[PDB]
Symmetry: C2
Subunit: 173 residues, 2 copies
């Protein structure tokens, strides 16, 4: 079967590093979910305005559809997403036959410290509060694990890989 | 003005690391170009069949359109692409007001050695020969620099950042 992984966490949590590390060892196709947003939604967030559920539904559906179409062609995927509510994850699960979540997170103060070590930001620091409010804990009937971003990425990637147990036959050589 | 960067190089050259490193310091929006391919085109390549010019035109146009629409909303971008011909780069340049290329490359034997250190592969090693044939050198009237993948990524990212000279006002805080 195909596998479909979502790395979920706020901006500056290190999602790209984790997703990329997982992809490189499993053959999963990596994609960045923000690229699926409309340009206007990206611009709105860049000015510091949080999106609503209504803003996000078409985006979530396009992600679900992209994963479903990849699945149909035998392609396994891993995508990075910003904060998701439980209902948002429900929409993602409407696409491909399964979705496994890696929830990358940690104390707000550590996240803020990470962001302070960068010159450029794609998203404003002011969005962090609203994002942490949007990020709903994984619930018992979902498939996912938490990755504490205070740990080194190499450890988190190994932890993810052990949990995901992606079948070797998913990759290519 | 908005900026639009393409990191071009074959699979396993380290494009994601470079693009991600540049994005993190400039605020450029990172996207992976393969996600814009149709599922069937991804599957075709995964079986080891190289795409043709005809297969690639709609993909290149969608990348150009995505960059143009981001530009219109004031959003600067950096994307990773596999091997591109000069004519392919012409199509990318039909979109946004400018495109700067970072050409990540090196000897085939070094690329093959990098790929051998990974368990999973998104694309088969057999595609490398055809990709190296498709990757046409940057020409004098194009905007780009070569990044030798034998160098450490930290050095290449600094080299890219110095050359790109992304205005600080492109980012957010």
């Amino acid at each position: 079967p195909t596998r479909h992984v979502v790395v979920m966490g706020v901006s500056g949590s290190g999602k790209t590093t984790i997703a990329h590390g997982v992809a490189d060892e499993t053959g999963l196709e990596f994609a960045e979910a923000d690229a699926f947003h409309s340009p206007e939604n990206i611009a709105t967030m860049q000015r510091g305005i949080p999106l609503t559920d209504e803003d996000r539904w078409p985006w979530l559906r396009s992600l679900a559809e992209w994963m479903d179409a990849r699945a149909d062609a035998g392609v396994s995927t891993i995508i990075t997403c910003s904060a998701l509510k439980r209902t948002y994850r429900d929409v993602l699960r409407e696409g491909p036959p399964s979705v496994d979540f890696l929830h990358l997170d940690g104390p707000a103060e550590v996240i803020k410290g990470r962001m302070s070590k960068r010159e450029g930001h794609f998203m404003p620091a002011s969005l962090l509060q609203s994002q942490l409010a949007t990020l709903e804990a994984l619930e018992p009937d979902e498939s996912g694990i938490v990755l504490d971003l205070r740990q080194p990425p190499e450890q988190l990637i190994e932890r993810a890989l052990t949990w995901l147990d992606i079948a070797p036959a998913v990759a290519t050589h």
